[PDB]
């Protein structure tokens, strides 16, 4: 897609902060502009839209136009955690919406209260498996995925959109072998010095 | 005010197979309509542009075609699928009335097409009960739940307490893992957790139940391997509180 391009990394923000997406189009005489919001696994929601040049404001959002140099940007502030997405810009001509590849943007939650701990939940007896979850953890730290191949490890989950309570980070580790412990499940990942490990 | 509806939502179909996918809009007249095809990591590409000025389609030559039946309802169709049909598809509407409006997209209808179906698993569903460990350091108690070994890729879990599904406390992977990172057609796993207090854990009255609908193959899809057709359907595991 080369009409409308949207060539940007992978953005990430910690909840609170600004982010911004660029979006370059190449046809002048393009009468208007669309932002899309498109989680994993839906289809596209639209943001907004302006076909005059300048900002146009709704909440959070600011969608700005340059019509000469032929930039489209969306503005999102006091970033939300449920803001992460892969974000679409496209581009209107004679009714004809071209869209740009996207980009993705991840905001990272801020946790008040960390209090990072690795356990050991216990199968309902119906598997052979044994998980190991490291949870509570702030956002600061990443989970690597693990060296052997018969672990293993999802780093990150999101919040079910109904969800009224608040948000925790945390990570899951399985396998079936017998010399797997949750000692050393994450010891690919760099956890906090002062990550709890309750001894059985 | 206006909308729009597309379906299937999710197809599993082998090669040579017929396509046919629906879109109806409602609350307007005489609307553009478009059918998208998306690939992931992409964004949408134009299959066809539809108004009262004409039909517009891709350069690009497709394997579909287009129909449009009644004022709103706009469908895309093939006679025999092949396996690079496979993608998210999306259907669209925009207001050709004064002003501008709709601009939206419908549900999607994700596609799969096989070239074998035999290669085709539903998810084995296990429930993993928390930490005593994390009910005393914390007073919550996280669940677990691990849906593994499907394929294709399209699961939907939910959880279930005292039989009405929960959002709070509920956090679940975006998308599956491969079990098989370097092999192809490899099968894959999803992870969820479902935190509650440790209080409501340890009552042994609360029950719990993760629920995973899987999609795969329809009654009229041939079978004859010993185990079960792995048609579309519901897995689940369950688990109690305990005391202790």
């Known amino acids: 897609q080369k009409e409308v391009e949207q060539n940007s990394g992978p953005l990430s923000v910690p909840e609170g902060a600004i982010a911004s997406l660029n979006c370059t189009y190449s046809?002048?005489?393009?009468?208007?502009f669309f932002w899309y919001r498109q989680y994993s696994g839906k289809s596209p929601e639209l943001i907004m839209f302006?076909?005059?040049?300048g900002d146009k404001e709704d909440g959070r959002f600011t969608a700005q136009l340059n019509k000469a140099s032929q930039h489209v940007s969306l503005l999102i502030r006091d970033s939300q955690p449920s803001d992460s997405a892969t974000y679409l810009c496209?581009?209107?001509?004679?009714?004809?919406?071209?869209f740009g590849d996207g980009t993705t943007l991840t905001v990272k939650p801020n946790i008040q209260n960390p209090d990072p701990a690795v356990y050991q939940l216990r199968d309902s007896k119906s598997s052979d498996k044994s998980v190991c979850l490291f949870t509570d953890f702030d956002s600061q730290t990443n989970v690597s995925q693990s060296k052997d191949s018969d672990v293993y490890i999802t780093d990150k989950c999101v919040l079910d959109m109904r969800s009224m309570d608040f948000k925790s980070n945390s990570a899951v580790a399985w396998s079936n072998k017998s010399d797997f412990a949750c000692a050393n499940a994450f010891n690919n990942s760099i956890i906090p010095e002062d990550t709890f490990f309750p001894s059985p | 005010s206006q909308t729009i509806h597309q379906w299937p939502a999710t197809l599993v179909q082998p090669v040579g197979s017929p396509l046919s996918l629906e879109c109806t809009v409602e609350?307007?007249?005489?609307?553009?309509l478009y059918w998208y095809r998306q690939a992931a990591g992409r964004g949408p590409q134009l299959l066809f542009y539809?108004?009262?000025?004409?039909?517009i389609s891709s350069e690009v030559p497709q394997n579909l075609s287009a129909s449009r039946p009644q004022d709103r309802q706009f469908i895309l169709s093939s006679k025999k699928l092949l396996l690079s049909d496979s993608g998210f598809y999306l259907c669209?509407?925009?207001?050709?009335?004064?002003?501008?409006?709709?601009?939206?997209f419908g549900e999607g209808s994700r596609l799969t097409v096989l070239e074998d179906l035999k290669n085709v698993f539903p998810p084995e569903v296990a429930v993993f009960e928390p930490s005593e460990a994390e009910i005393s350091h914390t007073q919550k108690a996280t669940l677990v739940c691990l849906a593994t070994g499907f394929y294709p890729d399209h699961v939907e879990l939910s959880w279930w307490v005292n039989g009405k599904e929960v959002h709070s406390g509920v956090c679940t992977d975006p998308q599956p893992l491969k079990e098989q990172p370097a092999l192809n057609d490899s099968r894959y796993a999803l992870s969820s957790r479902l935190r509650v207090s440790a209080t409501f854990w340890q009552d042994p009255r609360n029950h719990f139940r993760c629920q995973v609908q899987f999609y795969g193959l329809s009654e009229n899809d041939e079978w004859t391997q010993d185990r079960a057709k792995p048609v579309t359907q519901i897995v689940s595991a369950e688990a109690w509180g305990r005391a202790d």
């Open positions: 669209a509407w925009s207001e050709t009335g004064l002003g501008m409006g709709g601009w939206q």
């Open positions: 046809f002048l005489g393009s009468q208007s």
């Open positions: 302006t076909y005059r040049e």
């Open positions: 496209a581009v209107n001509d004679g009714g004809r919406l071209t």
């Open positions: 609350g307007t007249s005489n609307p553009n």
């Open positions: 539809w108004g009262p000025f004409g039909q």
